[PDB]
Amino acid sequence: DYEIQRERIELGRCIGEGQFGDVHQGIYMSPENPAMAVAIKTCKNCTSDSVREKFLQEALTMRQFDHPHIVKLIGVITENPVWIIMELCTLGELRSFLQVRKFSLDLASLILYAYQLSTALAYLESKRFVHRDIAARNVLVSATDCVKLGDFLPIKWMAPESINFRRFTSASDVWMFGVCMWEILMHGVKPFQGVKNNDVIGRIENGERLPMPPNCPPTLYSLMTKCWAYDPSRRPRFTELKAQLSTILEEEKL
Amino acid sequence: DYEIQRERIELGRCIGEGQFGDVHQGIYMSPENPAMAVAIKTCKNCTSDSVREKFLQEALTMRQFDHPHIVKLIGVITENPVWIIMELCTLGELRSFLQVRKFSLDLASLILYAYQLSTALAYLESKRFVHRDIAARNVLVSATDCVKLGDFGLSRLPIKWMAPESINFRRFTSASDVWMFGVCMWEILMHGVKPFQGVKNNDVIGRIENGERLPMPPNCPPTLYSLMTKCWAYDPSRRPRFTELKAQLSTILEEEKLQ
Ligand SMILES: CCC(=O)NCCn1cc(CNCc2ccc(Nc3ncc(Cl)c(Nc4ccccc4C(=O)NC)n3)cc2)nn1
Ligand SMILES: CCC(=O)NCCn1cc(CNCc2ccc(Nc3ncc(Cl)c(Nc4ccccc4C(=O)NC)n3)cc2)nn1
């Protein structure tokens, strides 16, 4: 059972914008458990059941999952105003965190974030779940050494087959994670900046790729470029990525 | 008419101060309605008949407008203590918002704000109403994707925002509103930095008359900066109207959403 009652949720400051409406922080006063910081996803346009089905469906998707690097669903209030209650990652969105802390972060913290995301995506691939939107913008920071995937067309992240044929598989999630890994190494800079979405598939199809970020280890960039094989069958799986990222990370810390 | 039963208002945290006194947020449970979050203007010296007339007249000014990006009058309490009850913009003032979320707002959101404000100003122009106090300071945030012109009385010399003809000749028209709007767009894209910071006001008219303009903010689209410079034509008859501004802003926005 996931129904929380409005009275155990204490609405706080707005912390950002979500796909459906403003996200707030708050406090969930469980009768059983010590009060906890929460993020409260709110919905505007939730009046029409049509969008409600889309808003509440993310909750039902996320209650499937239990992983230390996937934001945890705490519960839902399904009477209007409809809220989704999630755990709070207190250090905010990853893109902002990377931009604001650009000169206080060391390379191996960046590789660690990429490693932890690979453990969430290997977990997802083990459930045969395809996420479809792996990007730094869908990651939150729970601690300076702990990141969590959230958010259950972004042309500049998408695999060729996704743009061309709307095909979304474990291999196209691998493509996007490659882009995300690049974003982290670029301290939150978006891929293909100053390029129109319209010219993305054409340059991708002609073999253009994101360059190697400054100070990105050459072996880590080789990992990104394997994620960007045009042929989806030539791309690694997330267990391979996770293993290699552990090696690049252990070495980086020495 | 706009009278509201004080038993229906619970006063809340203070959110600022106007020339008549503290502004609070609060709760209003209207008959045939549920709870409502509201902003409450209070008047310190309402006992003076003249002050009360000026104060209440600020509510009449807002009563005449009905627009999604202008704060709405909810009602007035005319017995002492005299209050004005406004719609609440829960995220507060734009400049603070812009400063705090600087590394979180997409440029698309920055342009959306400018577009939404041009929509309110086009509406005001459609009523032949001249605002005269257009500034990021006077823009409120209802949501991360919705800003509103704040209370016109709370909006209030603002030399660094004013058109030259308003400085030199106290002329205020829709064209001078368009000048101030360009400054407000520059504030937005500068994340709440004030224009002409560290410059004396007497120096500002000299630079403007000399042809100096505010610089293109970092990461601002040239097309958008060029829109700003059109609003800062020294000659008021060369400034676009808000309908043009709004239409060009919707193109600029669509260009950002196509990256
Ligand atoms: C320091 C220098 C400096 O300049 N600081 C700037 C001043 N500042 C700091 C802050 C911090 N607040 C931002 C924040 C954002 C998220 C969380 N945690 C959080 N936790 C769980 C969720 Cl589910 C969530 N969701 C989301 C919330 C918003 C947007 C997207 C999602 C989402 O779901 N994305 C996939 N957010 C906690 C805080 N604000 N202004
Ligand atoms: C003295 C020492 C000291 O520490 N003081 C601290 C006092 N403090 C608190 C804050 C935080 N502000 C939060 C805020 C601001 C606005 C709204 N929402 C809101 N909604 C509707 C209206 Cl109509 C409105 N009106 C206005 C209200 C205030 C100012 C201008 C207008 C206006 O209409 N302008 C054109 N404001 C909601 C929250 N900053 N300072």
Coordinates of C-alpha atoms and ligand atoms in Angstrom, one line a residue:
Chain A
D1 CA 0.0 0.0 0.0
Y2 CA 1.3 3.4 -1.1
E3 CA -1.5 5.8 -0.3
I4 CA -0.2 8.4 2.0
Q5 CA -2.8 10.8 3.6
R6 CA -2.4 14.5 2.9
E7 CA -2.0 15.2 6.6
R8 CA 1.2 13.2 7.1
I9 CA 2.8 15.3 4.3
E10 CA 4.0 18.8 5.2
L11 CA 4.5 20.9 2.1
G12 CA 7.7 22.8 1.8
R13 CA 9.8 25.0 -0.6
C14 CA 9.6 24.5 -4.3
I15 CA 12.8 22.8 -5.4
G16 CA 12.5 22.7 -9.1
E17 CA 10.3 22.1 -12.1
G18 CA 9.1 18.6 -13.0
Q19 CA 7.5 17.4 -16.3
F20 CA 4.0 17.8 -14.8
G21 CA 4.4 20.7 -12.3
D22 CA 6.5 22.1 -9.5
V23 CA 8.5 19.8 -7.3
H24 CA 8.5 20.7 -3.6
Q25 CA 10.6 19.5 -0.8
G26 CA 8.7 18.5 2.3
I27 CA 8.6 16.2 5.4
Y28 CA 6.8 12.9 5.5
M29 CA 5.6 12.2 9.1
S30 CA 5.2 8.5 9.2
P31 CA 3.4 7.1 12.2
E32 CA 5.8 4.2 12.3
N33 CA 9.1 5.8 11.2
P34 CA 11.3 8.9 11.9
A35 CA 10.1 11.8 9.9
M36 CA 12.0 12.0 6.6
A37 CA 12.8 14.7 4.1
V38 CA 10.8 14.0 0.9
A39 CA 10.4 15.4 -2.6
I40 CA 6.8 16.1 -3.5
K41 CA 5.9 15.9 -7.2
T42 CA 2.8 18.0 -7.8
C43 CA 0.6 18.0 -10.9
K44 CA -1.0 20.9 -12.8
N45 CA -3.5 19.7 -15.5
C46 CA -4.1 16.8 -13.2
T47 CA -7.8 17.9 -13.2
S48 CA -8.3 16.0 -16.4
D49 CA -8.0 12.3 -15.7
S50 CA -6.2 12.0 -19.0
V51 CA -3.0 13.7 -17.7
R52 CA -3.6 12.2 -14.2
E53 CA -3.2 8.7 -15.8
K54 CA 0.2 9.9 -17.2
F55 CA 1.1 11.6 -13.9
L56 CA 0.2 8.8 -11.6
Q57 CA 1.7 6.1 -14.0
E58 CA 5.2 7.2 -13.2
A59 CA 4.6 6.2 -9.6
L60 CA 3.3 2.7 -10.6
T61 CA 6.4 2.4 -12.8
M62 CA 8.8 3.3 -10.0
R63 CA 7.3 1.2 -7.3
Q64 CA 8.7 -1.8 -9.3
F65 CA 12.2 -0.8 -8.4
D66 CA 14.4 -1.0 -5.4
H67 CA 18.0 0.1 -5.9
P68 CA 20.4 2.4 -4.0
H69 CA 20.9 4.5 -7.1
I70 CA 17.3 4.9 -8.2
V71 CA 15.2 7.5 -6.4
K72 CA 12.8 5.7 -4.1
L73 CA 9.1 6.2 -4.3
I74 CA 7.6 6.7 -0.8
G75 CA 3.9 7.0 -1.8
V76 CA 1.1 8.9 -3.5
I77 CA -1.8 11.0 -2.7
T78 CA -4.3 10.2 -5.5
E79 CA -7.0 12.7 -4.5
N80 CA -6.7 16.2 -5.9
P81 CA -4.3 17.9 -5.6
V82 CA -2.5 14.7 -6.7
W83 CA 1.1 14.4 -5.2
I84 CA 3.8 11.8 -5.7
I85 CA 6.0 11.5 -2.6
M86 CA 9.7 10.5 -3.2
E87 CA 12.8 10.5 -1.1
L88 CA 14.7 13.7 -1.1
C89 CA 18.2 13.9 -2.6
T90 CA 19.2 16.9 -0.7
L91 CA 22.0 18.2 -3.0
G92 CA 19.7 18.7 -5.9
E93 CA 19.9 18.1 -9.6
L94 CA 23.1 16.7 -11.1
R95 CA 23.6 19.3 -13.9
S96 CA 23.4 22.2 -11.4
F97 CA 25.6 20.3 -8.8
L98 CA 28.3 19.7 -11.5
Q99 CA 28.2 23.3 -12.7
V100 CA 28.2 24.9 -9.2
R101 CA 30.9 22.5 -7.9
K102 CA 33.0 22.3 -11.1
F103 CA 36.2 23.3 -9.3
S104 CA 35.5 21.4 -6.0
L105 CA 34.9 18.0 -7.7
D106 CA 37.8 15.7 -8.6
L107 CA 37.9 13.5 -11.6
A108 CA 37.2 10.3 -9.6
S109 CA 34.0 11.7 -8.1
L110 CA 32.8 12.3 -11.7
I111 CA 33.8 8.7 -12.6
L112 CA 32.0 7.5 -9.4
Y113 CA 28.8 9.2 -10.5
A114 CA 29.1 7.5 -13.9
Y115 CA 29.8 4.2 -12.1
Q116 CA 26.8 4.4 -9.7
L117 CA 24.5 5.3 -12.7
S118 CA 25.8 2.2 -14.4
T119 CA 24.8 0.1 -11.4
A120 CA 21.2 1.5 -11.6
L121 CA 21.1 0.8 -15.3
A122 CA 22.5 -2.7 -14.9
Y123 CA 19.9 -3.2 -12.3
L124 CA 17.3 -1.9 -14.7
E125 CA 18.5 -4.2 -17.6
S126 CA 18.3 -7.2 -15.2
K127 CA 14.6 -6.5 -14.9
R128 CA 14.5 -6.2 -18.7
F129 CA 13.4 -2.6 -18.3
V130 CA 14.2 0.1 -20.9
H131 CA 14.4 3.6 -19.4
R132 CA 14.4 5.7 -22.6
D133 CA 15.7 8.9 -21.1
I134 CA 19.2 8.6 -19.6
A135 CA 20.5 12.1 -19.4
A136 CA 22.3 14.0 -16.6
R137 CA 19.1 16.1 -16.2
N138 CA 17.3 13.0 -14.9
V139 CA 19.9 12.4 -12.1
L140 CA 19.8 13.8 -8.6
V141 CA 22.6 14.1 -6.0
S142 CA 21.9 12.6 -2.6
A143 CA 25.5 13.1 -1.3
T144 CA 28.8 14.2 -2.8
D145 CA 29.5 10.5 -3.4
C146 CA 25.9 9.3 -4.2
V147 CA 23.8 9.9 -7.3
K148 CA 20.4 8.5 -8.1
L149 CA 18.6 8.1 -11.4
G150 CA 15.1 9.6 -11.6
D151 CA 12.4 10.4 -14.2
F152 CA 10.5 7.2 -15.0
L153 CA 12.1 14.6 -27.8
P154 CA 15.6 14.6 -26.3
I155 CA 17.2 14.3 -29.7
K156 CA 20.7 15.0 -28.6
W157 CA 20.7 12.0 -26.2
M158 CA 18.9 9.5 -28.4
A159 CA 20.3 6.5 -30.3
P160 CA 20.0 6.5 -34.1
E161 CA 17.4 3.8 -34.1
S162 CA 15.4 5.8 -31.6
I163 CA 15.3 8.9 -33.8
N164 CA 14.9 6.9 -37.1
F165 CA 12.5 4.1 -36.1
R166 CA 11.4 4.9 -32.5
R167 CA 13.2 1.7 -31.4
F168 CA 14.0 1.7 -27.7
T169 CA 16.0 -1.3 -26.4
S170 CA 18.6 -1.9 -23.7
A171 CA 21.2 -1.0 -26.4
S172 CA 19.6 2.4 -27.0
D173 CA 19.7 3.0 -23.2
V174 CA 23.4 2.2 -23.5
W175 CA 23.7 4.9 -26.2
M176 CA 22.1 7.5 -24.0
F177 CA 24.1 6.6 -20.9
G178 CA 27.1 7.2 -23.1
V179 CA 25.9 10.8 -23.6
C180 CA 25.1 11.1 -19.9
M181 CA 28.6 9.9 -19.1
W182 CA 29.9 12.6 -21.4
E183 CA 27.7 15.2 -19.7
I184 CA 29.1 14.3 -16.3
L185 CA 32.7 14.5 -17.5
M186 CA 31.8 17.9 -19.1
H187 CA 30.6 19.2 -15.7
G188 CA 27.0 19.5 -16.9
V189 CA 27.4 21.0 -20.3
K190 CA 24.7 19.8 -22.7
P191 CA 25.8 17.7 -25.7
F192 CA 25.8 19.4 -29.2
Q193 CA 25.4 22.9 -27.8
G194 CA 24.8 25.4 -30.6
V195 CA 23.5 22.6 -32.9
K196 CA 19.9 22.4 -33.8
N197 CA 18.0 19.2 -33.0
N198 CA 17.3 19.0 -36.8
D199 CA 21.0 18.5 -37.7
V200 CA 21.7 15.9 -35.0
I201 CA 20.7 12.7 -36.8
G202 CA 22.5 13.8 -40.0
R203 CA 25.8 14.4 -38.2
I204 CA 25.4 11.2 -36.1
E205 CA 24.7 9.2 -39.3
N206 CA 27.9 10.7 -40.8
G207 CA 29.9 9.4 -37.9
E208 CA 30.3 12.6 -35.9
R209 CA 30.5 12.0 -32.1
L210 CA 30.9 14.1 -29.0
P211 CA 34.6 14.9 -28.5
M212 CA 36.5 13.9 -25.4
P213 CA 35.9 16.3 -22.5
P214 CA 39.0 18.1 -21.2
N215 CA 40.7 16.1 -18.4
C216 CA 38.5 13.0 -19.3
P217 CA 40.7 9.9 -19.1
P218 CA 41.3 8.5 -22.5
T219 CA 40.1 5.0 -21.4
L220 CA 36.8 6.5 -20.1
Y221 CA 36.3 8.3 -23.5
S222 CA 36.9 5.0 -25.2
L223 CA 34.0 3.6 -23.1
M224 CA 31.7 6.4 -24.3
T225 CA 32.6 5.8 -27.9
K226 CA 31.7 2.1 -27.6
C227 CA 28.3 3.2 -26.3
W228 CA 27.9 5.2 -29.5
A229 CA 28.3 2.3 -32.0
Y230 CA 25.9 3.0 -34.8
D231 CA 25.0 -0.7 -34.9
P232 CA 23.1 -1.4 -31.6
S233 CA 24.5 -5.0 -31.5
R234 CA 28.0 -3.7 -31.2
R235 CA 27.3 -1.8 -28.1
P236 CA 28.2 -3.2 -24.7
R237 CA 25.7 -4.1 -22.0
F238 CA 25.5 -2.3 -18.7
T239 CA 27.2 -5.0 -16.7
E240 CA 30.3 -4.5 -18.9
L241 CA 30.1 -0.7 -18.5
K242 CA 29.8 -1.1 -14.7
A243 CA 32.8 -3.4 -14.5
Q244 CA 35.0 -1.2 -16.6
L245 CA 33.9 1.9 -14.8
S246 CA 34.9 0.3 -11.6
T247 CA 38.4 -0.3 -13.0
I248 CA 38.7 3.3 -14.4
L249 CA 37.6 4.5 -11.0
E250 CA 39.9 2.4 -8.8
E251 CA 42.8 3.4 -11.0
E252 CA 41.8 7.1 -10.9
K253 CA 41.8 7.0 -7.1
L254 CA 45.4 5.8 -7.1
Chain B
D1 CA -18.6 44.7 -4.1
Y2 CA -15.0 43.7 -3.3
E3 CA -15.6 43.7 0.4
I4 CA -14.4 40.5 2.2
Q5 CA -15.3 39.3 5.6
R6 CA -12.2 39.6 7.8
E7 CA -13.2 36.4 9.6
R8 CA -12.4 34.7 6.2
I9 CA -8.7 35.9 6.3
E10 CA -6.0 34.3 8.4
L11 CA -2.9 36.4 8.3
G12 CA 0.3 34.6 7.6
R13 CA 4.0 35.2 7.2
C14 CA 5.1 38.7 6.1
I15 CA 6.5 38.7 2.5
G16 CA 7.6 42.3 2.1
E17 CA 6.8 46.0 2.6
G18 CA 5.1 48.6 0.5
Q19 CA 4.8 52.3 0.9
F20 CA 1.6 51.8 2.9
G21 CA 3.0 49.0 5.0
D22 CA 3.8 45.3 5.3
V23 CA 2.6 42.8 2.8
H24 CA 1.6 39.4 4.2
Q25 CA 0.7 36.1 2.7
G26 CA -2.4 34.4 4.2
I27 CA -5.3 32.1 3.7
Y28 CA -8.8 33.0 2.5
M29 CA -11.6 30.4 2.5
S30 CA -14.2 32.0 0.2
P31 CA -17.9 31.1 0.4
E32 CA -18.7 28.5 -2.3
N33 CA -14.9 28.0 -2.5
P34 CA -12.2 26.1 -0.6
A35 CA -9.1 27.5 1.1
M36 CA -7.1 30.0 -1.1
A37 CA -3.6 31.3 -0.7
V38 CA -3.6 35.1 -0.8
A39 CA -1.3 38.1 -0.5
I40 CA -2.5 40.8 1.9
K41 CA -1.4 44.4 1.6
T42 CA -1.8 46.3 4.9
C43 CA -2.0 50.0 5.4
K44 CA -0.2 51.5 8.4
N45 CA -1.7 54.9 8.4
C46 CA -5.1 54.1 7.0
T47 CA -6.7 56.2 9.7
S48 CA -5.8 59.2 7.6
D49 CA -8.6 59.6 5.0
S50 CA -6.1 60.7 2.3
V51 CA -3.9 57.7 2.9
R52 CA -6.8 55.2 2.9
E53 CA -8.0 56.7 -0.4
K54 CA -4.6 56.3 -2.0
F55 CA -4.3 52.8 -0.6
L56 CA -7.8 51.6 -1.7
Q57 CA -7.3 53.3 -5.1
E58 CA -4.4 50.9 -5.7
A59 CA -7.0 48.1 -5.5
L60 CA -9.3 49.8 -8.0
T61 CA -6.3 50.1 -10.4
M62 CA -5.9 46.2 -10.3
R63 CA -9.6 45.6 -10.5
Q64 CA -9.8 46.8 -14.1
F65 CA -7.4 44.0 -15.4
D66 CA -8.1 40.4 -16.0
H67 CA -5.1 38.6 -17.5
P68 CA -3.3 35.3 -16.7
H69 CA 0.1 37.1 -16.2
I70 CA -1.1 40.0 -14.0
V71 CA -1.9 39.4 -10.3
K72 CA -5.6 39.6 -9.6
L73 CA -7.4 41.6 -7.0
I74 CA -9.4 39.2 -4.7
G75 CA -11.1 41.9 -2.6
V76 CA -10.7 44.6 0.0
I77 CA -11.5 45.0 3.7
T78 CA -12.3 48.7 4.1
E79 CA -12.8 48.8 7.9
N80 CA -9.7 49.4 9.9
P81 CA -7.3 47.7 9.6
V82 CA -7.8 48.3 5.9
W83 CA -6.4 45.4 3.8
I84 CA -6.1 44.6 0.1
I85 CA -6.3 40.9 -0.7
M86 CA -4.5 39.8 -3.9
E87 CA -3.8 36.4 -5.6
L88 CA -0.7 34.9 -4.2
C89 CA 2.4 34.1 -6.3
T90 CA 3.8 31.4 -4.0
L91 CA 7.4 31.5 -5.4
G92 CA 7.8 35.1 -4.7
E93 CA 9.7 37.9 -6.5
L94 CA 11.4 37.2 -9.8
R95 CA 14.9 38.6 -9.1
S96 CA 15.5 36.5 -6.0
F97 CA 14.1 33.5 -7.8
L98 CA 16.4 34.2 -10.8
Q99 CA 19.4 34.6 -8.5
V100 CA 18.8 31.5 -6.4
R101 CA 17.9 29.1 -9.3
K102 CA 20.5 30.6 -11.7
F103 CA 22.1 27.2 -12.4
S104 CA 18.7 25.5 -12.6
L105 CA 16.7 27.6 -15.0
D106 CA 16.9 26.6 -18.7
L107 CA 17.4 29.5 -21.1
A108 CA 14.0 28.3 -22.4
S109 CA 12.4 29.2 -19.1
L110 CA 14.2 32.7 -19.2
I111 CA 12.7 33.3 -22.6
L112 CA 9.3 32.0 -21.5
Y113 CA 9.2 34.5 -18.7
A114 CA 9.9 37.3 -21.2
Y115 CA 7.3 36.0 -23.5
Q116 CA 4.7 35.8 -20.7
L117 CA 5.5 39.4 -19.5
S118 CA 5.1 40.7 -23.1
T119 CA 1.7 39.0 -23.1
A120 CA 0.6 41.1 -20.0
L121 CA 2.1 44.2 -21.5
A122 CA 0.4 43.6 -24.8
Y123 CA -2.8 43.3 -22.9
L124 CA -2.2 46.6 -21.0
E125 CA -1.3 48.3 -24.2
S126 CA -4.6 46.9 -25.7
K127 CA -6.3 48.9 -22.9
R128 CA -4.3 52.0 -23.6
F129 CA -2.9 51.7 -20.1
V130 CA 0.7 52.8 -19.5
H131 CA 2.4 50.9 -16.6
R132 CA 5.5 53.1 -16.1
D133 CA 7.1 50.8 -13.6
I134 CA 8.2 47.8 -15.6
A135 CA 11.2 46.1 -13.9
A136 CA 12.3 42.6 -12.9
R137 CA 11.7 43.8 -9.3
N138 CA 8.0 44.0 -10.0
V139 CA 7.6 40.6 -11.6
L140 CA 6.3 37.8 -9.4
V141 CA 6.6 34.0 -9.9
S142 CA 3.4 31.9 -9.6
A143 CA 5.2 28.7 -10.7
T144 CA 8.5 27.8 -12.4
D145 CA 6.7 28.1 -15.7
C146 CA 4.5 31.2 -14.9
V147 CA 5.4 34.8 -14.0
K148 CA 3.0 37.7 -13.4
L149 CA 3.3 41.4 -13.2
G150 CA 2.9 42.3 -9.5
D151 CA 0.7 44.8 -7.8
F152 CA 0.9 48.0 -9.7
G153 CA 0.8 50.0 -6.4
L154 CA 3.6 47.9 -5.0
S155 CA 5.5 48.4 -8.2
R156 CA 5.8 52.1 -7.2
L157 CA 13.2 57.6 -9.6
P158 CA 14.0 54.4 -11.5
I159 CA 16.4 56.2 -13.8
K160 CA 18.3 53.0 -14.9
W161 CA 15.1 51.5 -16.3
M162 CA 13.4 54.6 -17.8
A163 CA 13.3 55.7 -21.4
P164 CA 15.2 58.9 -22.2
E165 CA 12.1 60.9 -22.9
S166 CA 10.7 59.9 -19.5
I167 CA 13.9 61.0 -17.8
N168 CA 14.2 64.2 -19.9
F169 CA 10.5 65.2 -20.4
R170 CA 8.5 63.0 -17.9
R171 CA 6.8 61.5 -21.0
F172 CA 5.3 58.1 -20.3
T173 CA 3.7 56.2 -23.2
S174 CA 3.5 52.6 -24.4
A175 CA 6.8 53.2 -26.3
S176 CA 8.5 54.0 -23.0
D177 CA 6.9 50.9 -21.5
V178 CA 8.6 49.1 -24.3
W179 CA 12.0 50.7 -23.3
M180 CA 11.6 49.5 -19.7
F181 CA 10.5 46.1 -20.9
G182 CA 13.8 45.7 -22.7
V183 CA 15.7 46.5 -19.5
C184 CA 13.5 43.9 -17.7
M185 CA 14.4 41.3 -20.4
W186 CA 18.0 42.1 -19.8
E187 CA 17.6 41.6 -16.1
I188 CA 15.9 38.2 -16.8
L189 CA 18.6 36.9 -19.0
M190 CA 21.2 38.3 -16.5
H191 CA 19.6 36.2 -13.8
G192 CA 18.4 39.1 -11.7
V193 CA 21.5 41.4 -11.9
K194 CA 20.4 45.0 -11.9
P195 CA 21.1 47.2 -14.9
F196 CA 23.9 49.7 -14.8
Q197 CA 25.2 48.4 -11.5
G198 CA 27.7 50.6 -9.7
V199 CA 26.8 53.5 -12.1
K200 CA 25.4 56.8 -10.8
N201 CA 22.0 57.7 -12.3
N202 CA 23.2 61.0 -13.7
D203 CA 25.9 59.1 -15.5
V204 CA 23.3 56.7 -17.0
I205 CA 21.5 59.3 -19.1
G206 CA 24.9 60.4 -20.5
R207 CA 25.8 56.9 -21.7
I208 CA 22.4 56.3 -23.1
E209 CA 22.4 59.6 -24.9
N210 CA 25.9 58.8 -26.1
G211 CA 24.4 55.6 -27.6
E212 CA 25.7 53.2 -25.0
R213 CA 23.4 50.2 -24.3
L214 CA 23.3 47.4 -21.8
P215 CA 25.6 44.6 -23.0
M216 CA 24.4 41.3 -24.5
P217 CA 24.1 39.0 -21.4
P218 CA 26.2 35.8 -21.5
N219 CA 24.5 33.0 -23.3
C220 CA 21.7 35.3 -24.6
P221 CA 20.6 34.5 -28.2
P222 CA 21.8 37.3 -30.5
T223 CA 18.2 37.4 -31.9
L224 CA 17.0 38.2 -28.4
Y225 CA 19.6 40.8 -27.7
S226 CA 18.7 42.4 -31.0
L227 CA 15.1 42.5 -29.8
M228 CA 16.3 44.3 -26.6
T229 CA 18.2 46.9 -28.7
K230 CA 15.1 47.6 -30.8
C231 CA 13.3 48.4 -27.5
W232 CA 16.1 50.8 -26.6
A233 CA 15.8 52.9 -29.7
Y234 CA 16.3 56.5 -28.5
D235 CA 13.5 57.5 -30.8
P236 CA 10.2 56.2 -29.3
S237 CA 8.5 56.0 -32.6
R238 CA 11.1 53.4 -33.7
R239 CA 10.3 51.0 -30.8
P240 CA 8.1 48.0 -31.6
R241 CA 4.8 47.6 -29.9
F242 CA 4.3 44.7 -27.5
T243 CA 2.4 42.6 -30.1
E244 CA 5.5 42.5 -32.2
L245 CA 7.6 41.8 -29.1
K246 CA 5.4 38.9 -28.1
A247 CA 5.4 37.4 -31.6
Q248 CA 9.2 37.7 -31.9
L249 CA 9.6 36.2 -28.4
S250 CA 7.5 33.2 -29.4
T251 CA 9.8 32.6 -32.3
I252 CA 12.9 33.0 -30.2
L253 CA 11.4 30.6 -27.7
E254 CA 10.6 28.0 -30.4
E255 CA 14.1 28.4 -31.6
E256 CA 15.4 27.5 -28.1
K257 CA 13.1 24.5 -27.8
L258 CA 14.6 23.3 -31.1
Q259 CA 18.1 24.1 -29.6
Ligands
LIG1 C1 25.0 26.1 -3.7 C2 25.3 27.2 -4.7 C3 24.1 27.7 -5.5 O1 24.2 28.6 -6.3 N1 22.9 27.2 -5.1 C4 21.7 27.5 -5.8 C5 20.6 27.8 -4.7 N2 19.6 26.7 -4.7 C6 19.8 25.5 -4.3 C7 18.7 24.8 -4.5 C8 18.5 23.4 -4.1 N3 17.2 22.9 -4.5 C9 17.3 22.1 -5.8 C10 16.9 20.8 -5.5 C11 16.4 20.0 -6.5 C12 16.1 18.6 -6.2 C13 16.3 18.1 -4.9 N4 16.0 16.9 -4.6 C14 15.1 16.0 -5.2 N5 15.0 14.8 -4.7 C15 14.1 13.9 -5.2 C16 13.5 14.3 -6.4 CL1 12.4 13.1 -7.1 C17 13.7 15.5 -7.0 N6 13.0 15.8 -8.1 C18 13.2 16.9 -8.8 C19 13.2 18.2 -8.3 C20 13.5 19.3 -9.1 C21 13.7 19.1 -10.4 C22 13.7 17.8 -11.0 C23 13.4 16.7 -10.2 C24 13.4 15.5 -10.8 O2 12.6 14.6 -10.5 N7 14.4 15.3 -11.6 C25 14.6 14.0 -12.3 N8 14.5 16.4 -6.4 C26 16.8 18.9 -3.9 C27 17.1 20.3 -4.2 N9 17.8 25.7 -5.0 N10 18.4 26.8 -5.2
LIG2 C1 12.8 43.8 6.9 C2 13.9 42.8 7.4 C3 13.7 41.4 6.8 O1 14.4 40.4 7.0 N1 12.6 41.2 5.9 C4 12.3 40.0 5.3 C5 10.9 40.1 4.5 N2 11.1 39.4 3.2 C6 10.4 38.3 2.8 C7 10.9 38.1 1.6 C8 10.5 36.9 0.7 N3 9.5 37.4 -0.3 C9 8.6 36.2 -0.6 C10 7.5 36.5 -1.4 C11 7.3 37.6 -2.2 C12 6.1 37.8 -2.9 C13 5.2 36.7 -2.9 N4 4.0 36.7 -3.6 C14 3.2 37.7 -3.9 N5 2.0 37.4 -4.5 C15 1.2 38.4 -4.9 C16 1.5 39.7 -4.7 CL1 0.4 40.9 -5.2 C17 2.7 40.0 -4.1 N6 3.0 41.3 -4.0 C18 4.3 41.7 -3.5 C19 4.8 41.2 -2.3 C20 6.0 41.6 -1.8 C21 6.8 42.5 -2.6 C22 6.3 43.0 -3.8 C23 5.0 42.6 -4.3 C24 4.6 43.2 -5.5 O2 3.4 43.1 -5.8 N7 5.5 43.8 -6.2 C25 5.1 44.4 -7.5 N8 3.6 39.0 -3.7 C26 5.4 35.6 -2.1 C27 6.6 35.5 -1.4 N9 11.7 39.1 1.3 N10 11.8 39.8 2.2

